[PDB]
Amino acid sequence: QISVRGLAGVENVTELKKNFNRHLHFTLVKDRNVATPRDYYFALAHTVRDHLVGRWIRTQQHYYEKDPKRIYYLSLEFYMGRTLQNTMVNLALENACDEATYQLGLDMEELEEIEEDAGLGNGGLGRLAACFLDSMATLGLAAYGYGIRYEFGIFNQKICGGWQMEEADDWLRYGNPWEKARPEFTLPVHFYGRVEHTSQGAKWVDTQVVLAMPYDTPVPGYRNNVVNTMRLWSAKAPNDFNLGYIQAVLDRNLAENISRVLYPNDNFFEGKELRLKQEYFVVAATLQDIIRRFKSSTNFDAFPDKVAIQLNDTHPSLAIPELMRVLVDLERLDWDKAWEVTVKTCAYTNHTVLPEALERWPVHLLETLLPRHLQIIYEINQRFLNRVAAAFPGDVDRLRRMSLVEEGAVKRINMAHLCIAGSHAVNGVARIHSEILKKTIFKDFYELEPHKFQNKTNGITPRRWLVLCNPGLAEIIAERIGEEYISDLDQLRKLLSYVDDEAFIRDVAKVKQENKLKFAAYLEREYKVHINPNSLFDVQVKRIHEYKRQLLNCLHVITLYNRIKKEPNKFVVPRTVMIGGKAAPGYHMAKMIIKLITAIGDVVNHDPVVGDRLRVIFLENYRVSLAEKVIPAADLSEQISTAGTEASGTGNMKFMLNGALTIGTMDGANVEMAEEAGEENFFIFGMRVEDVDRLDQRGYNAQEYYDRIPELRQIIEQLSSGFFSPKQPDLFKDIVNMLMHHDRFKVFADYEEYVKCQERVSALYKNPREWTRMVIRNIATSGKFSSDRTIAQYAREIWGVEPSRQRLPA
Amino acid sequence: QISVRGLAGVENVTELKKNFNRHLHFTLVKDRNVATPRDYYFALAHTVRDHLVGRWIRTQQHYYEKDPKRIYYLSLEFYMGRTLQNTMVNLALENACDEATYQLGLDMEELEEIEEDAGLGNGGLGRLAACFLDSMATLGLAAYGYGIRYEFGIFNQKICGGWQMEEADDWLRYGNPWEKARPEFTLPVHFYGRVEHTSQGAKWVDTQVVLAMPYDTPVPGYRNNVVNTMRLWSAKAPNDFNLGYIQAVLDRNLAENISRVLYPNDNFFEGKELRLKQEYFVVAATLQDIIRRFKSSTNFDAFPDKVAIQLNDTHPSLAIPELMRVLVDLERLDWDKAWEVTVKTCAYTNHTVLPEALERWPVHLLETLLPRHLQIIYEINQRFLNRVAAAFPGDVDRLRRMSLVEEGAVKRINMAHLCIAGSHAVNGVARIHSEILKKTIFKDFYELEPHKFQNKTNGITPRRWLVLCNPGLAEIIAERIGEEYISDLDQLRKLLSYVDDEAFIRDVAKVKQENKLKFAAYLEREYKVHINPNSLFDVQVKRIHEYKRQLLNCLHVITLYNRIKKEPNKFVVPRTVMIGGKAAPGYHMAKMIIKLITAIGDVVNHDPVVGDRLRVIFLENYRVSLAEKVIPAADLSEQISTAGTEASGTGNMKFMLNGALTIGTMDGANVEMAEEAGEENFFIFGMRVEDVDRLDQRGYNAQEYYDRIPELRQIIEQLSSGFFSPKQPDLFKDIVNMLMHHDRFKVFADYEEYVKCQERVSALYKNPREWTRMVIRNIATSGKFSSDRTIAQYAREIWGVEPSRQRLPA
Numbered sequence A, B: 001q002i003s004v005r006g007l008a009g010v011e012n013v014t015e016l017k018k019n020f021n022r023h024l025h026f027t028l029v030k031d032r033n034v035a036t037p038r039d040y041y042f043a044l045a046h047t048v049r050d051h052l053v054g055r056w057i058r059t060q061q062h063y064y065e066k067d068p069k070r071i072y073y074l075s076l077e078f079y080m081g082r083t084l085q086n087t088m089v090n091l092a093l094e095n096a097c098d099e100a101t102y103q104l105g106l107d108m109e110e111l112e113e114i115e116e117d118a119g120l121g122n123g124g125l126g127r128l129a130a131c132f133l134d135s136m137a138t139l140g141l142a143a144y145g146y147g148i149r150y151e152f153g154i155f156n157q158k159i160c161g162g163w164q165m166e167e168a169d170d171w172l173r174y175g176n177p178w179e180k181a182r183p184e185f186t187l188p189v190h191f192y193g194r195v196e197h198t199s200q201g202a203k204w205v206d207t208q209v210v211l212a213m214p215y216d217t218p219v220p221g222y223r224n225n226v227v228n229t230m231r232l233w234s235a236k237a238p239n240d241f242n243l244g245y246i247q248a249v250l251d252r253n254l255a256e257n258i259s260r261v262l263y264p265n266d267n268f269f270e271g272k273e274l275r276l277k278q279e280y281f282v283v284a285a286t287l288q289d290i291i292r293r294f295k296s297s298t299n300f301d302a303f304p305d306k307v308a309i310q311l312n313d314t315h316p317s318l319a320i321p322e323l324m325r326v327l328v329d330l331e332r333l334d335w336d337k338a339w340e341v342t343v344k345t346c347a348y349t350n351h352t353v354l355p356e357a358l359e360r361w362p363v364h365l366l367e368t369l370l371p372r373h374l375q376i377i378y379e380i381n382q383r384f385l386n387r388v389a390a391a392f393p394g395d396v397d398r399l400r401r402m403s404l405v406e407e408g409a410v411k412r413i414n415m416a417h418l419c420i421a422g423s424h425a426v427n428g429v430a431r432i433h434s435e436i437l438k439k440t441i442f443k444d445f446y447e448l449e450p451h452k453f454q455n456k457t458n459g460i461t462p463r464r465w466l467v468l469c470n471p472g473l474a475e476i477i478a479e480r481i482g483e484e485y486i487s488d489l490d491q492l493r494k495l496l497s498y499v500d501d502e503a504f505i506r507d508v509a510k511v512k513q514e515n516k517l518k519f520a521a522y523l524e525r526e527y528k529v530h531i532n533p534n535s536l537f538d539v540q541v542k543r544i545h546e547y548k549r550q551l552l553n554c555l556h557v558i559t560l561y562n563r564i565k566k567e568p569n570k571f572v573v574p575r576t577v578m579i580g581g582k583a584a585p586g587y588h589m590a591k592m593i594i595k596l597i598t599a600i601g602d603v604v605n606h607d608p609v610v611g612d613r614l615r616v617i618f619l620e621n622y623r624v625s626l627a628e629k630v631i632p633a634a635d636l637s638e639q640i641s642t643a644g645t646e647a648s649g650t651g652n653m654k655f656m657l658n659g660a661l662t663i664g665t666m667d668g669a670n671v672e673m674a675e676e677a678g679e680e681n682f683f684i685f686g687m688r689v690e691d692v693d694r695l696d697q698r699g700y701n702a703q704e705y706y707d708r709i710p711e712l713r714q715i716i717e718q719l720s721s722g723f724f725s726p727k728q729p730d731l732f733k734d735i736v737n738m739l740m741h742h743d744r745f746k747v748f749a750d751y752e753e754y755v756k757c758q759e760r761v762s763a764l765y766k767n768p769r770e771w772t773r774m775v776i777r778n779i780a781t782s783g784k785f786s787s788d789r790t791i792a793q794y795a796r797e798i799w800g801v802e803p804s805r806q807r808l809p810a
C-alpha cells in the first residue's frame, strides 16, 4: 500500500499465511467453519508474537554477555494501549501482514479493533512510561520497565443519563498473548512483623509473606532488532497461607488483592493501606531482581556503575530505604558506604506541584506495615538534617521545612523530601516546571544541593503517535524527505522548505480531511452520533480536573451558543466541540463537570436555529486507542490549564505532530512548543505565571469579572436558573458556587482573553491555505518533542550511558 | 524398548524432536542454555498436545454431522491424575517420544514426574468418573464429562510429628497445557431472587448473576482416533458486579469463590451454602449447553432420544428441577410433558448406604438460594406421593417414609428421593450393594417401581491401571496372548493356560520383584526411608474412614510385633506394612488413626529385636500418581471394610490386575472378584452381611471380645497405658473408648478370623511357586473389572446407545 509500512515480499506473505493457519488450528483449536473475528485476531497476534521471540532471546543474551549498565524504570503505571500494530510497525511487518490477511479474506484493520488496551495507567504519567520504553529500546539501552500486573486497569467509562458510570476493565478475560508468565522466577515480599536488635544488627522478623510472580512483555525497538523487557509483578499467596480448611483457602484472596486493581486517581493522593502495599510490593520484588542480576554479572562499590534506578514520581520511593535495608541488614555494608551507593544509583522525576497530589504517608501506617523502613527513614532524616544545620547554622525554620518528617495532629513522611535526599538527580518535566521546583516547593533543597536539579522536557514516541495513528501524514512527509525522520524527528525541520509548495499544502489538507471523515464515520457506527465533517474540530481530551479548566471551554461553548441565538442569521465558522476524559470515581466536582458538558450538548445539539453550525459531543471512554483516532482528526487542540499548574502535558505534543493548531496558556511544555514554532504560529492567551502570582497577592475576587462582563453574567444566570437542567433547576449550584467563591484556578480571569483568542482561530480557519501553512510550521518544528530526544538526555545527563541506533543481527 | 509402547519410526522421531525444539523456543521462550527439567516437561507436553488437536476437532465435527445420542456425565469430581503418559499410550506415541527425548539427552521418565496431578476429586467416586471418561472414548460414545474447574483440588498431605497437616494444592501455578479456555462460550447462572406469578406463569426475578466460563480438556480413546471433551466450569463475576469503587472491584472475589476449592469429604455430607452453590452452578451451566446443542442438531418429544444425563450420586441432583424449570417456565411445556421428558433423560447412580453421606438440604437454604427450584420440588413431591397413595391406599407411614420432604426441627429435602422420583434408572455399583438398596434404604421405592432398579458393577480402565503403571506386566502378557486384551480385558482368561508354565511363572514373579525394587528406591530417594525388598509388601491405600477399618489392620500389626517380642528367635515371614490415605480435615477420629499408625511405626521400626522382619510405613500424600507406583509393587491388598459398608471399591480391582493377592471381607465388589477367581484363590475372612445383622439384633458388646481374647486385651492395655505414646500416655484414649463402647463397625468382631487368615497368607508366601500360581489365577480372571465392560452395560441398559471399537480416520 504505502511505503512507510514496509515490503510485502512473496516469501514473507506465504510464510505469514502458513503460520496464521497453524495457530488457528493448533493454538486456538478452531476450524475455519466456526472461527470468529476474535479468533482471527488471536491467530494474527500469535503469528506476529513469533517474530519477536528470536530477537527477544538474542537481546537478553547480548546484555548477559556484554554486561552494560542496566537502567531500571520503576513505575506504578504503564499505559501501553494495544500492541499488535505497534509490533508490526517496529518489525517492518505491517504491509506483509496486511497482504497476508487480505489473501485469507480478512481485513486487518477490523482485526486490530478487537484487541483490548492494556490500560495500566491513568493518563500522562502512565503514558510517558510507555513512550519511554519504546524510546529506550529504539536507542539500544539495556533498559527494564518494572511495575504491577493489575488484573483490572483503568475503569471503562459509560455515560448514563449524562453521568459517568464506572465498569471494571476486565482486560485479561480473553487472555493476553503478549505476556509470558515466569512462575519459576517468583520472589517473596515481606509485610508487618517487628524489628529485633542483635549483636549482628537489626533483624526484621515475624513477617507475613506475599509472593511476587513476574510476567514479561516484549518491548521492540524501531527496526533495530532490539527487544527489551517490561516485567510486571502479580501477587500470589504462599501455599501454607493460613494453613477451618475451606475458609483458609478462600482467604488467599486477601494477599492476591495487592495486584487486583489500579488506583484511578490522576494527580491526587489517597493514603490507603492497600496503595502502600502496592508501592512496597513493586519495590521489594524489583530490587531483588536487580541485586540478583548484579551478582551474576560481593563488591557493591561498582553497583552504581552497573545499575540506574529511575523513580517515576514518589510512588516507588520506598526503593531508597529498601536498598539501604538490603545493603545494611543483609549484605552488612556500613551505613555511609550503603548511602553513597544508594544516592549514586537513584534518580527522581517529579510530575506536579499541586499539594494534594504529594504523597505524605502517616507514620502509624508505616510503623505497622514496614517497621524497619520507618527506622531507616528516621536515620536518613537525622543525618540529612545534620547536613542542613552545618550549611545554614541557626536556621531553625529551614530544619522544620526540609524535614522528611512532618509534624501535626498526624505525623507524616514527605516522600518527595525522601526522594530528593536519596537521589543524585531530581528533574522536572518541562523548563517552566523545573524552574518552578527550584523557586518554590523545593527551593530549600536547591539551595543545599543545586547540582541535583535538572530539567528533562517530556516527549512522545513518533512511532505510535505518527506512523501508527496517522499513516497518511507519515507517507506524504516520507515522499518529500524520506523515512529517517521516524527515528530522528528533528529532520521534520526540512518541511519548512515546503511551506509555499502548493502540492504539499493540498496534500496536508487532504490528509486532515480524510482523517476527519474517518473519525466522523467511527462516531456514527459505534455511537450513532452524526457530525459535520466540514466544521472545525475543536478538541479537549485529557482527564477531568479543575486545573485543566474544561469549565473554561464550557463557558466559551455557551458564549458561542448565546451569540448565535442573539444573531441567528449572521455567519459563523461551524465547530464540532469535542470534550473527553475520565473523572476519578471519588471526585465530585469532576463528575459534575461531565454532567454539565452533556447538559450543554442536550440544549445546543437539538436547537433548530443552531443547525449544523455548533455541535457539542462528549467522547466516552477516552483511552489510548481512542486518542489514536481523535488526535489525527483534530483541527484545534485545547491546552488551557491555569499558568503554573500543568507540569508539562504530552497530549499537546501529540496534537502538534498530527496537524492541529494549539490554543493554550503559557503553561508546561506549551511554552517550549511556542518557542520552537514561533509565537506567531500559536494561539497563546491568558495570564502568565507572574500574572497569577500578582492576583494571588491582592486576592482573587470572581465577582469583579461577573460585574464587568455582561456575556459572562448571562452564562452564570443561565446555569443558576436551570436553563441547562429544566427538571432540576439547582443541579449546577455547586459549580456556580465554586466559580463565584472558591475557584483555585481563576476561570473567570482568563475568560475575556480566551474568547477573543477563539475569535482569531475562527478568522484563520476561514482561510484554508493560511491555516494549512501555519499547520506546516507546527509539524515542521515538532522534532524537539520526540521521546527519543528526552531519553537521550536522561541517558547522557542522569544515567551515564550512551544511546545507539546500531542494529543487532536478526 | 517394549512392544506394547508402539513403534519409534525414523520420520516420527525426527518430527517429534523438531516440534519439541520449536515449542522450547516459541512457546516457552527459553534457550537450551537456561532451560530446566520443568521447561523440558512443558515442551514435551505441548508437542504431544499438538497430536490431539486434529483428532479432537474431527471428532466433534463428526458428532455435529452424524448427530448421535449424546451422553452427559455430570459429576462434582473428576480425579484425573497426570495426562502426559496416558495421552502417549492412547496415541501410540510412547516409544517414539522416549526415543526422541533420549536423542535430545533427556530422560522421559524424569520429565513425567514434573507434571502435577489434576486432583479434582477425593477418592473412588472421582476416580470412577475419570476411568469412565477413558472407557466412553475407547468405546466411541458421543460423551461429555461436565464438572467444575477447582482452582485448588484435594489438599496436599504433609505428616508433621506424626500428624496430618493440609497444604493447598495450587495445581495451576505453572499452567495447565491440556486445557483450552473458551471464554467465548461463557453462560449466566442465577442465584437468590424471588418468584412472581403472572398470567403467563412463574418468573424468577431479581437474581444475582455469576458467569460460568468453560475450559475444555481432550479425552483420547485407546488407538481409535476418538477424542472426547471434558468441560469444566470456572466462576467469573459480571463486569457491572457491585458497579466505593476499589471495594466493589475487590468484592468480585465473592462470586469467583464458587469454583475456588474442592470440598474434601469422602463419603460424608456437609450442608454448607457454598457447596450448594457449586452444585447448582455445574447443573445450570451444563443444562444450557445441553439445550443449545439439542436445538442446533421446538419439539422436546425427541429430547430423550438425543440426550442422556447421568447423575454421579446426588451431587448434581438439581438437574432434575432445573430441567423442569427450563421446560415449563422458559419453553412453556405443560408439566406432564416436561416430567415425561425429564424422567426419560435422567438416571442416578448411588455410591453409599452410610446415612451420614446422604444429602439432605435444609429447606431454608433452598428457599433463599433457589426459590423457584424449591417450588418445583414441592410439586414433584405432591404428584409423586399421589402415585404412592393410589398404589398403597391407607399406608400413611409409607407416605412419610417416601416423601422428598423430611419433617423435624429443621425440614430438609432428601436428594436421593428426588433422584429416584425423577430418573428412569437407579443403579448401585456392585451386586451386593444393588441388592442392599432394594432390601433396605430404597425398599419402598423398589416396591413402587421395580423396573427402575439396576446394578452396574464398577470397573477400572486397563490403560492407566495396567499398561501405563505396569508396562513390564503388560509386556509379558502381550508376549503370550498379543495386544488385543488392552481393549478387551476378558482375553486375560487365556492366561489360565499358562498356570503350569515354568517360564510364565518366573516372568510374573520377576516383574513383581522389579516393581518392588523400583518402589523401594523411590521411597529412599524422596522420603529417605529404607525398606527390605524381599519382604511381603502388605498394602492398604484408600481414604481414612472408620468403615474401611485401617484400625483392624493396626491391631494385626501390633499382634505381629507382640508375637515377635514374645518369641524373638522364631522365624516369621518378613513384612513391610504400608498404609496410606488422606483424612478429611474436620474428621477427628480419622486424624487420630493416622497418628496411631505413625506411632506404631516409631516403636516397631526402631526395635533392634524386630530387625528387618517387620516395618510399618505411612505413605504420605496418597493420590493417583502414587497409586500408579505402589499398586504394581504390592503383594497383599487389604480390603477389610465391615460387610455391607463398601458399596464397591475400585482399589481392590487395581490390585487384582497388578498381581497382588487379596485379603478381604465379603463386601462390595470383593464378592464378585472372589466369584471370578474362585474362593480358593482369595483370602476371605470375617462376618458376612447376614452375620453383621444378627449381631445388631442382639447388640454389639465389644467387652465380650476383650474378655475372651488375651492377645486383644494386651493390645488395648498397651494403647491405654501409653506404650505407643510415652510422653502423652492418654493420647489414644478416644480410640480406645470408641473401640470399647461406640464402634459402629465392629472391629473386634472380625479380629480373630483376620489374624488367622493373615497366618494363611504368610504360609503361602513361604512357597513362591504356589503364591505366583495363585497370582496368575487372579490376573487371568480380572477381565470383568474393566470399566469398558461397565460402560458397555450403562450404554445398552440405561442410555440406549451401542458401543463401537471402530476407528475414526486419523
Ligand SMILES: O=C(/C=C/c1ccc(O)cc1)O[C@@H]1O[C@H](CO)[C@@H](O)[C@H](O)[C@H]1O
Pocket: A122, A123, A124, A125, A126, A128, A265, A266, A267, A268, A269, A270, A351, A352, A357, A429, A458, A646, A647, A648, A649, A650, A668
Ligand atoms: O499524570 C500525572 C500524575 C499522576 C499520578 C499522580 C498521583 C497518583 O497517585 C497517581 C498518578 O502527572 C502528569 O505527568 C505527566 C507526565 O510527566 C505531565 O505531562 C502532566 O503535566 C502531569 O500532570
Ligand SMILES: O=C(/C=C/c1ccc(O)cc1)O[C@@H]1O[C@H](CO)[C@@H](O)[C@H](O)[C@H]1O
Pocket: B122, B123, B124, B125, B126, B128, B265, B266, B267, B268, B269, B270, B351, B352, B357, B429, B458, B646, B647, B648, B649, B650, B668
Ligand atoms: O467416593 C464415594 C463417595 C464420595 C463422596 C460422597 C459425598 C461427598 O460429599 C463427596 C464425595 O463413594 C465411593 O464410590 C466408589 C465409586 O462407586 C465406590 O467404589 C466406593 O465403594 C464408595 O465408597
Ligand SMILES: O=c1[nH]cnc2c1ncn2[C@@H]1O[C@H](COP(=O)(O)O)[C@@H](O)[C@H]1O
Pocket: A057, A060, A061, A064, A293, A296, B031, B033, B034
Ligand atoms: O547463568 C546463566 N547462564 C547462561 N545464560 C544466562 C545465565 N543467566 C542469564 N543468562 C542469559 O540471560 C538471559 C536473561 O536473564 P535475566 O537477565 O536474569 O532475566 C537468560 O534468558 C539467558 O539467555
Ligand SMILES: O=c1[nH]cnc2c1ncn2[C@@H]1O[C@H](COP(=O)(O)O)[C@@H](O)[C@H]1O
Pocket: A031, A033, A034, B057, B060, B061, B064, B293, B296
Ligand atoms: O453452526 C455450526 N456450523 C458448523 N459447524 C458447527 C456448528 N456448530 C457446531 N459445529 C461443529 O461442532 C463442533 C462442536 O461444537 P459444540 O458441540 O457446540 O461444542 C464445532 O467446533 C464445529 O466443528
Ligand SMILES: *Cc1c(COP(=O)(O)O)cnc(C)c1O
Pocket: A122, A123, A124, A127, A541, A542, A543, A622, A623, A624, A627, A648, A649, A650, A651, A652, A654
Ligand atoms: C497523552 C494522553 C494523556 C495525557 O494528556 P494531557 O493532555 O497531557 O493530560 C492522557 N490520556 C491518554 C489516553 C493519552 O494518550
Ligand SMILES: *Cc1c(COP(=O)(O)O)cnc(C)c1O
Pocket: B122, B123, B124, B127, B541, B542, B543, B622, B623, B624, B627, B648, B649, B650, B651, B652, B654
Ligand atoms: C482407586 C483409588 C481410590 C479408591 O480406592 P478404594 O480402595 O476403592 O477406596 C482412592 N484414591 C485413589 C487415588 C485411587 O486411585
